Amino acid sequence: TNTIFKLEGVSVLSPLRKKLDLVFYLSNVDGSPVITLLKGNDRELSIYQLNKNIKMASFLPVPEKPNLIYLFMTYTSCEPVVMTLNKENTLNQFKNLGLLDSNVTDFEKCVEYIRKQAILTGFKISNPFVNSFHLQCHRGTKEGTLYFLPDHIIFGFKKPILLFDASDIESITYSSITRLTFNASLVTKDGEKYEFSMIDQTEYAKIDDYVK
């Protein structure tokens, strides 16, 4: 058929918080890649011409929840997307759609499949954690996750979600050194300042090396 694959009951956090069905198909008009989140039979979100409107996309680990994984993507025109995939469910479905062998146990297989289908349609989804790392910190009062990717830093996923180009970092300065943690402040080349607090001190080495 027209659809390449379909995951049901993916949990979306952004740009809305709601359990939906993800469909990845090619337009019947010009055979272009398309991603749509629908609630049953209603289009809650669509991103057309994915091979053109996708700024970046990748799978990101969910902290302390190995059976879950994030799909994060930023786009241009709609009609950042963040949704958790259940690894087990996604495995059972991909098998039940003949997309993977019934013997396959590893979830990396599901990821590998999706990565390929993405490329065949003309865009790329990353898998940085297959050097990348992530940690917990606070922004003001709200806890969150810093993901250090090869070319990007992400802060997710309470609104607002922050996405830095590693190339766009001017400075980092450390303060508030307690017996367990420290604070760090990213200054972009544009002069914007962002401060992250309550960073475990074991993370200093990886962070400072990343920025240097």
Side-chain angles (χ1 to χ4, degrees), residues 131-143:
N131 200 35
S132 306
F133 57 93
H134 58 90
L135 49 101
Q136 298 302 117
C137 62
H138 281 74
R139 184 189 187 182
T141 56
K142 295 296 176 287
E143 187 177 2

Side-chain angles (χ1 to χ4, degrees), residues 157-171:
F157 289 103
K158 293 182 187 164
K159 298 156 182 163
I161 302 167
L162 312 184
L163 171 60
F164 308 81
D165 283 358
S167 161
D168 275 318
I169 304 308
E170 179 189 346
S171 325

Side-chain angles (χ1 to χ4, degrees), residues 41-191:
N41 62 12
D42 300 334
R43 288 182 284 97
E44 294 287 335
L45 190 157
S46 290
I47 309 175
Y48 309 99
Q49 288 177 333
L50 291 176
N51 64 329
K52 306 167 189 185
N53 293 354
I54 286 307
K55 294 169 176 176
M56 77 151 288
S58 72
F59 290 96
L60 295 51
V62 183
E64 290 179 326
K65 289 209 157 191
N67 185 47
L68 303 182
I69 200 181
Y70 285 128
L71 186 37
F72 161 99
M73 48 187 106
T74 54
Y75 52 101
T76 52
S77 284
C78 157
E79 176 87 27
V81 171
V82 174
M83 58 190 103
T84 72
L85 283 45
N86 185 312
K87 297 188 180 179
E88 188 189 7
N89 295 19
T90 298
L91 265 172
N92 288 353
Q93 292 183 41
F94 271 24
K95 290 186 192 175
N96 281 6
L97 295 188
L99 290 172
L100 299 158
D101 279 354
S102 178
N103 78 65
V104 161
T105 72
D106 193 18
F107 176 77
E108 293 311 323
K109 297 300 186 170
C110 294
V111 167
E112 172 170 18
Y113 177 87
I114 301 168
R115 308 268 309 290
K116 286 180 185 171
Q117 290 320 320
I119 277 179
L120 271 39
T121 70
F123 77 105
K124 196 169 195 179
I125 311 180
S126 314
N127 202 23
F129 296 80
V130 156
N131 200 35
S132 306
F133 57 93
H134 58 90
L135 49 101
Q136 298 302 117
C137 62
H138 281 74
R139 184 189 187 182
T141 56
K142 295 296 176 287
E143 187 177 2
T145 311
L146 280 175
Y147 289 91
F148 287 79
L149 309 197
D151 292 312
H152 302 277
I153 301 172
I154 303 180
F155 183 71
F157 289 103
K158 293 182 187 164
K159 298 156 182 163
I161 302 167
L162 312 184
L163 171 60
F164 308 81
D165 283 358
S167 161
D168 275 318
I169 304 308
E170 179 189 346
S171 325
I172 178 168
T173 64
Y174 313 97
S175 77
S176 305
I177 301 177
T178 66
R179 66 173 299 277
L180 287 178
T181 69
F182 70 94
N183 293 7
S185 282
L186 268 56
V187 168
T188 63
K189 290 177 174 177
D190 292 341

Side-chain angles (χ1 to χ4, degrees), residues 2 25-34 48-52:
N2 194 33
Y25 64 104
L26 307 176
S27 169
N28 269 321
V29 173
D30 60 11
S32 274
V34 176
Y48 309 99
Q49 288 177 333
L50 291 176
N51 64 329
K52 306 167 189 185

